[PDB]
Amino acid sequence: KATMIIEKDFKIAEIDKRIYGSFIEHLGRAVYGGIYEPGHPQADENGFRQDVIELVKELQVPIIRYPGGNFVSGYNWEDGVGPKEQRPRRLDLAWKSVETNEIGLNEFMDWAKMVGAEVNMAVNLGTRGIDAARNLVEYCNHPSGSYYSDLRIAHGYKEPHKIKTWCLGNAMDGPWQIGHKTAVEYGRIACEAAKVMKWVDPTIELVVCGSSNRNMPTFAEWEATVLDHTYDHVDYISLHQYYGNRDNDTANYLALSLEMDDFIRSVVAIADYVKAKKRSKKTIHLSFDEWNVWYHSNEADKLIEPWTVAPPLLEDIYNFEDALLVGCMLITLMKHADRVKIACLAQLVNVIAPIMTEKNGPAWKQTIYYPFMHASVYGRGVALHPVISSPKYDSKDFTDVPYLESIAVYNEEKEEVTIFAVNRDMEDALLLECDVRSFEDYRVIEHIVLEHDNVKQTNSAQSSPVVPHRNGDAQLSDRKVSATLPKLSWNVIRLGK
Amino acid sequence: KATMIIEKDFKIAEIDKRIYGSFIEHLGRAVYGGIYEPGHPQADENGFRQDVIELVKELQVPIIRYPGGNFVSGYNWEDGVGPKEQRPRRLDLAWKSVETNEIGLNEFMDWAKMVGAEVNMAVNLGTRGIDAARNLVEYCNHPSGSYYSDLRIAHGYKEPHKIKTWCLGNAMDGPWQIGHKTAVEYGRIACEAAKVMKWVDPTIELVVCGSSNRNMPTFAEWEATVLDHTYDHVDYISLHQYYGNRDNDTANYLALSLEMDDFIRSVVAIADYVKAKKRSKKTIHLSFDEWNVWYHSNEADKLIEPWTVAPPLLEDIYNFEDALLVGCMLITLMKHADRVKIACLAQLVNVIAPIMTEKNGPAWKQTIYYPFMHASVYGRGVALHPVISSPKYDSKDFTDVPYLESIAVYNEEKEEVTIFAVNRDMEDALLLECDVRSFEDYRVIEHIVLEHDNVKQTNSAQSSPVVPHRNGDAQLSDRKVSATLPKLSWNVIRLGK
Amino acid sequence: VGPKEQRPRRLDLAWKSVETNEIGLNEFMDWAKMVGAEVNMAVNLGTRGIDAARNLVEYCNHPSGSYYSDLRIAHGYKEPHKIKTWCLGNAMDGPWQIGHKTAVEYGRIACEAAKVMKWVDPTIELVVCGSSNRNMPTFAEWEATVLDHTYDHVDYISLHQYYGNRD
Ligand SMILES: O=[N+]([O-])c1ccc(O[C@@H]2O[C@@H](CO)[C@H](O)[C@H]2O)cc1
């Protein structure tokens, strides 16, 4: 048995819809054979797969980070614009692939328009620096009357792209990165790039890069130093986290969102330290601009020979337990809506992705597609503070793990309240009771449930045994929602009227 | 009108009673003519003023920091123990006074026993270091069978003092401090002192010093560096704040607790940054070990000639608005009960103090005595998260200042809820409505009010025009407590059942 | 040193023991003479520093005619001990050590101690301390920094190793 109070007046914050963002890199088949496949029977006039477009639209992803990721740190943006005959073939050192540049930034912008997403554009601060950063902002955002703006027009794009949010490089702390920089070296170049970008277009916002991983030896130290160098000139700091179940311990695996919670709290603390050090009135928020499960494909990738075009890298096939953890991660983002304003599921198509494609063949929804879709579609509004009383368990790496992971979101315009809830219990149902006295005249619309008896079950092109159903038993009586949350389940309880 | 939800299940934390601590330094008349005055008519067998003892007991102060403060940084603890004829007269460079050492640590411990307080003992890390720190802990806490423990016994104190909580120096970031140290120098000596102290007695806990003032050029940087050097070896970081009304702006003055709130949040953030950097499982908490109003006596002190014994320094005479600000500071401490575990009103007797004495004469209660007493007496339990809707104003230095400053404290053992509330409005009463649905069968016990028509009115030995009354109108009807909070008032609304 | 009744009982924080000081350096020298060994004497560079280092070398090695040499004589040891080889502290890179010092802090105090010790008695030689363990995070870095600070003034660098068969 668990209880919850859902009080309209106990609020975290309005949820920024950009927490339901995603990310496409020039990596593997994310672009080539993912969003773009000129051969394909379902390709549009520009070569974009229409089936993939529909699948992304249904997720209602508001913002997509591009073009990297590790790729960007060795990339020259000019190589991907202008007539195709003049675009060079390059060695991408990030993913040991040949990049044809058949898709570059203007074609990506065309695709993003089709799916209804804005683009969070990254600049290269690995091999390049401040001059290229200002020039790219000018190219994309300045209307006309300068060399680079008139160049964009000549390339066929009269109106500026007007990109709002930009990433200052990719995480550079990683010794695997092209043009690795220490926190001081990065903080300095990011500061100077931020300035010139903002001078070209003061309407932009900037994301400064945090650590590649919470496990880096420089974790926390990095963020504090980088913010000390950049605070006045930037708007967000990023964080990145990938999880996996490499020891087949489901109870411990589902608890990993507790670590994510502490991780967010730690980076918020660093931002507020530096705010105080600077005596600034501006608050810096978080961009959780890579997050996902990533581990299934690690061994397969080791067999791929270098210098092919569009190798099948990072093609994790997700299972049901991966979906539960993704649900827990989503709820964790919502619970930090006050300070996490952007987040990006890494990545959107083929590469550690909720959408998978086959050459000349179908596109399909992985298990993780469903909780992401439900969060994005039903998770707009104000995140309410969870007062939860829940039974708890201990695992290898965590103590006092609540069986219930939940939050409610109130949308005043739609007059809806949605309760997202994971039951982590591997054996028993959890009887949830929610005090909803603060909302008058509400009823249960539906109770969606994602569950499967085998946590290792996957979806595929041919069959999808892991799919939601609408037979949850939530009922609302004398100002109390009572709902049975099945063992190992993701639940979306929708209230309205 | 203002509203407030008093929800039992929306909790901040259990209040550590040590947030109602105080502080006595060898400064002015705090010791000599304050707690200790041989031949005063109310002096006991050991020369301690009984009237002061009774006044301190009524405040229920659980812990008292001693002996400094700036004094400790030039003090040799051996100078204050053993037979009086062998105790040297010293020049105290902190307060430009001659210190006779007629009172030293063992006599202070005797006094502390009379008022029922434990002592938060500070070690000198200005002119002294790690050897003196281990020796003092041995002297105080080791039972017997070593030179320093047997020395304590020979000085007349068979049983060890068993001091739990120790300060590693006094703030020495300040260029006015004896033996100023940079953050690195201080962090290093504090680290090595902490270790040897703990090796003498592992039951102790340690407070590492924060900045002298939030306005120091090294604020925030200091705390981060000091914790980086000491984290594994210490338990708390300190913070210090004094306020004054030097431009006669009451509306701006009463808003200052908003700054105190930001200040605490900033130091918490620093502690959590360093925790993440170290990958520690230990949370460091805060000791707000100097706070008060301090400004009235600044000009008078400039006329005192150096090298007298017990000069009348820091003798602020508090007024009614000062008591309102102190009330707001107390509520702010309670609002941070989750992370502020020790706090010390600086100071307890004569020196910026709630209790004042006259030579061979009376002891009396300053205006600020009353809100401190009420907080300490009625503010034990769990601090509840305030959910308030209040009208607001702007002042010189602050925006959106709520007219209402309030919190509720729930004592389950006493079956009581106490609402502390200041109305900052200089013209209008505030009609407070409190939702108490979650406290069924609770009734109003009493409504205490501290108010005076003249914010500049003081108390004195001869008369106390500023004193609480019990004519508050709080009343319960239909699960709602409604109370009129007069303009410029401190209110204590006690509920029970 | 000196009469036993004036020797204090101390808390030894290293091994969490009470040290009575019933044996001190002069008695140890008497023992060493019986087994035919010279003594490699260590000075405290944890809680103490350069003054105590010069004074101890004077006490042990200076013949007579100064306070500390005449003190040794008064304690019953007319002839100086004439200790050749001295350790500048014990390894203090370790967070378990009393008065831990960074490599720079240690290098500096060891340098200044070495100088005054040698000025009391130029016949001595000095050992500067290496890491407590090869597995310390500061291994190798430590030795390089410490020698950079002390090279001209010292004769040896130390190293320490313990083994076990715990699997
Ligand atoms: O933890 N790791 O092993 C790890 C490895 C690679 C890594 O790179 C990030 O993930 C890649 C895929 O999204 C992006 O290009 C890059 O920014 C981030 C983390």
Ligand SMILES: O=[N+]([O-])c1ccc(O[C@@H]2O[C@@H](CO)[C@H](O)[C@H]2O)cc1
């Ligand atoms: O901001 N200031 O002006 C200021 C002035 C003095 C000051 O010292 C502190 O306040 C003294 C009195 O409680 C204690 O001895 C010392 O720790 C701390 C701050």
